Structure 1
Amino acid sequence: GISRDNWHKRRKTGGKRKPYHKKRKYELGRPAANTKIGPRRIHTVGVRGGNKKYRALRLDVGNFSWGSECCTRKTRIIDVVYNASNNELVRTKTLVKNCIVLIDSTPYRQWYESHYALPLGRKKGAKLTPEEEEILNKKRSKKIQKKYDERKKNAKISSLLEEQFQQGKLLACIASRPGQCGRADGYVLEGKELEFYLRKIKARKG
């Protein structure tokens, strides 16, 4: 049907070539996955040699890494915001490798606040004191405050992330192939990559 051959097309000189044989089965191609945001729908295909391949049609959740902090957790996927290859892919919300996405900040915030014994995403005292202060302060015999200098002297996060945590969303990049692995999975944007894509997002519409 669809095929990926080299012989249907012309040579260096601009000259044509005539067909050598009928279409062979090892020259095959197949339609694209076009993965959307939505509750899990995966289908499987048999491939050359009798092996299996996984094709994701809908995904709602992924695995993401905050490489700066050595933390990775299972996280909800919210929206797609930039695509370097084609604007119709963000207009129709399709998920592919090196796409830029928004993810839920919550499991990183909960890891940080319990690891460093400090607040992160907080606005004012009404969202600090009335509950869950007992995550931050407890009885800690000979481990109370000064021994947390192992934590507190390296706790400060970049200003570009502290502005994202207060809105409840982080920017991330997809590293897996979702139409081939069945998974959407990647890493949190940081540093000069974060500066580059914030400029590109703002310069397109804002």
Structure 2
Amino acid sequence: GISRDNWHKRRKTGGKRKPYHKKRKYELGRPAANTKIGPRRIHTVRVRGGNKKYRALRLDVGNFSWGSECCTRKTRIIDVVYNASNNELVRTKTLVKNCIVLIDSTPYRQWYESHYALPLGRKKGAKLTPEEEEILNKKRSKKIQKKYDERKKNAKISSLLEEQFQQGKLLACIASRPGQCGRADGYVLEGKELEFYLRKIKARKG
């Protein structure tokens, strides 16, 4: 079909090679996943050595690692913002490796409040009338508030992250190949990584 052959194209000198053999089967290429954000669709491709390769074609779920205190869930992938390869990979909302995507914040806001015992984002004056997340912040014993007391001094998150939670949309980097492995897994941008990619979102806007 399409091939990866190291004989069809030119020399260092610009001289052209004559073909000694016709396209070999081990010199194989296949059509790309071009994997979308929709309800999950992953096809199976049989590859060299009768092994199994998982073409993700539509993909909503994926694993996103929070950088600083290592909390990672099966999170929804809501948008594609930036792709350093091609700006046409962004518009046609395609997940590839080193994509700058948007995900759900609330699976990691749920971990923060369970662990750090403080409201994260939340425009101040807003109250929860069911009152279940306020149970997940307060209502502890004597000596185990001390376990939280010494955790409140390692609590102050990056202020660039906090606004993503306040909007409810975390900027994340795809660190897996969804077309090859069959997962849109990755990690959450923090610090100078985010402060870079946020400028390339302003650079696009005008």
- The TM-score, its normalising length taken from structure 1, stands at 0.93
> Can you list the C-alpha shifts for 1:148-177, whole angstroms capped at 9, x where unaligned?
222111111111111111100100000000
CA contact (8 A) 2:123 2:166 kept: yes
CA contact (8 A) 1:122 1:128 kept: no
Partner of 1:35: 35
Two-structure CA RMSD over aligned residues (Å) = 1.7
* Cα deviation, residue 41, structure 1: 0.7
Distance 1:41 1:136, change over 3 A: closer
* Cα deviation, residue 49, structure 1: 1.2
Alignment of 1:83-94 (within 5 A): 83-94=83-94
> Can you list the C-alpha shifts for 1:78-124, whole angstroms capped at 9, x where unaligned?
10000101111111111100000001000111111111111112113
Distance 1:167 1:35, change over 3 A: same
Query: Helix, strand or coil: the match of 1:11?
Result: coil
Query: Helix, strand or coil: the match of 2:198?
Result: helix
**May I ask how many residue pairs the two structures share in their alignment?**
206
* Cα deviation, residue 27, structure 1: 1.1
CA contact (8 A) 1:123 1:166 kept: yes
* Cα deviation, residue 136, structure 1: 4.3
Distance 1:50 1:137, change over 3 A: closer
How many angstroms apart in 1 are the aligned matches of 2:67 and 2:181? 22
- For structure 2, the 5+ residue unaligned runs are none
CA contact (8 A) 1:118 1:136 kept: no
Query: Helix, strand or coil: the match of 1:36?
Result: coil
- The TM-score, its normalising length taken from structure 2, stands at 0.93
Which of 69-78 and 135-144 deviates more? 135-144
Distance 1:95 1:149, change over 3 A: same
Identity of aligned residues (%): 100
- For structure 1, the 5+ residue unaligned runs are none
* Cα deviation, residue 7, structure 1: 1.0
* Cα deviation, residue 16, structure 1: 2.2
Distance 1:16 1:134, change over 3 A: closer
Distance 1:124 1:18, change over 3 A: same
How many angstroms apart in 2 are the aligned matches of 1:37 and 1:22? 39
CA contact (8 A) 1:117 1:135 kept: no
Which of 160-169 and 121-130 deviates more? 121-130
Query: Helix, strand or coil: the match of 1:6?
Result: coil
